[PDB]
Amino acid sequence: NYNPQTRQYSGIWDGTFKPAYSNNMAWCLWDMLTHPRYGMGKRLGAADVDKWALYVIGQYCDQSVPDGFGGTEPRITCNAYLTTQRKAWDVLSDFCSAMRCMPVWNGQTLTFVQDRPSDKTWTYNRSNVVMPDDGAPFRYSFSALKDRHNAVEVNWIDPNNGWETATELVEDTQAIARYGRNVTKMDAFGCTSRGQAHRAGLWLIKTELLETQTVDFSVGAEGLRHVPGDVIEICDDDYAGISTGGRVLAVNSQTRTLTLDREITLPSSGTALISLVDGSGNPVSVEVQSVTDGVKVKVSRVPDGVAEYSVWELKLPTLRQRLFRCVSIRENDDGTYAITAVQH
């Protein structure tokens, strides 16, 4: 479907390829991984790499983004002339550093996980996760002072001023007042545009200013669904200070009342939605109407087959969601899975 000149897609892809010249970075990486005579085609077949994730990465790479001069340019375009002989890992982590995707081996195929906005997958409250002997279900750790970079110098070759390399400085003035100045040097791979180098530096500065928290916890017997790159929400009662998660003790369909595990208080001037797990197995949000004795609620409708001891979550409008992004899932002998995440 791809049209290299106009960078436009026609319809739904069918899994077939055609030969053409393009600047797209995703298909440059695909050519790197799976070409027989010079690339890595003999070790790594075409079935081991998933062409379906590279499709959406290529779509993300071709969107129109403003440049400084007032025009519009694609985000990422591969312009490279590779002359020296390096390790395959170095070239792979130079191709995956420009489009900011981490190459992780899924169970069956090698997949690429990119950093673009995404929606939540599953919610883990204090009842879903394993309680260690210490007594702390979640353990949060933060980034260091000197690891929060503020100024980056990016090298890129200049088509206009002769193809000699030129450096650009990206800075954050507000962050420097707080954390001091932490300077870093970086190279932009396949860069021949000033806007792309500036965005490459700005991504580091913003991701190290904004996302500074990680969490580690264990989830038992239902971690089969998770692979690296999933985005999950954490509802920690101790962190928030208010009860937001539990399990259902009894359901009454005729009166539409749920007896919860612990007492809850309705917020003032708002509507609270209680998440429920349907008999089919997909979350179904329903709007809370009243709480009788703290334990009992009165939902608008009761989803079909809400069994006893099923996870429920309270979604207040005031509180902000706490999303996370998995980076490792260590299978354990006890049948539990240890999950590590970084703020999203």
């Binding site: 010079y38 790594l44 070239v91 089969l224 669904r225 490792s328 260590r330 299978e331």
Partner: protein, 232 residues
């Protein structure tokens, strides 16, 4: 997310669950051997465990260390299997240490297992529910009279690979003989020592200019002649 079937997720959610069975399959087709099926337990009737039609055999085998992390080095799980009776020795002397074959692992809840296993049958049998993952044997860390331990690895590993990979040589051809790039298909001509021959079994190119001239295929020569004059 892996596209796990709905019934498997419902089984994962429940408080009281059925047994979890891991079904190992060792594939040696690429190397030149046959595919072997093993499982850790027998069924309830004292027979090999039957999943679909495979009928995995009982044999002490354990695999530990599997993980899903891309931040650091590769995963490198470990698989341990016993050879008290000398099976692993027989496979390793013959198929060159079982290095290069595939290992496929399936996790199926005992609830969906085939109805042949249980004496009273299973009404919930469903052969589509499983979780599959493929690895490739890398090394045989130990081999003894008690047990034998292999270390697996991902099919896509980048340890010995360099990207451009093609060398410009002055006197030696880098192509593979009779391959796609050499493009030669004809009668056997010479030996690997540039000695004339006609038997097809012992026809090999010497990767030299004379060896290529035997084929009159000088046009497709891999190397670039007379570079050493300039490099000097």
């Amino acid at each position: 997310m892996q596209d796990i079937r709905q019934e498997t997720l419902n089984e994962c959610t429940r408080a009281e669950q059925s047994a979890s069975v891991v079904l190992w399959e060792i594939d040696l087709t690429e190397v030149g051997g046959e595919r072997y099926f093993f499982c850790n337990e027998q069924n309830e009737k004292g027979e090999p465990v039957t999943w679909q039609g495979r009928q995995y055999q009982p044999y002490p085998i354990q695999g530990s260390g599997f993980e899903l992390n891309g931040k650091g080095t590769s995963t490198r799980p470990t698989l341990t299997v016993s050879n008290l009776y000398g099976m692993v020795t027989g496979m390793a002397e013959d198929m060159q240490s079982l290095v290069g074959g595939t290992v496929v692992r399936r996790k199926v809840y005992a609830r969906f297992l085939d109805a042949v296993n249980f004496v009273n049958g299973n009404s919930y049998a469903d052969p589509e529910q499983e979780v599959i993952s493929r690895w490739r044997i890398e090394q045989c860390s130990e081999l003894s009279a008690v047990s034998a331990s292999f270390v697996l690895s991902t099919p896509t590993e980048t340890d010995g690979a360099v990207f451009p990979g093609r060398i410009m040589l002055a006197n030696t051809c880098t192509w593979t003989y009779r391959g796609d790039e050499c493009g030669y298909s004809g009668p056997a001509v010479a030996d690997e020592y540039d000695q004339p021959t006609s038997d097809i079994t012992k026809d090999k190119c010497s990767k030299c200019l004379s060896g290529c001239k035997f084929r009159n295929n000088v046009g497709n020569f891999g190397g670039f002649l007379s570079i050493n004059k300039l490099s000097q």
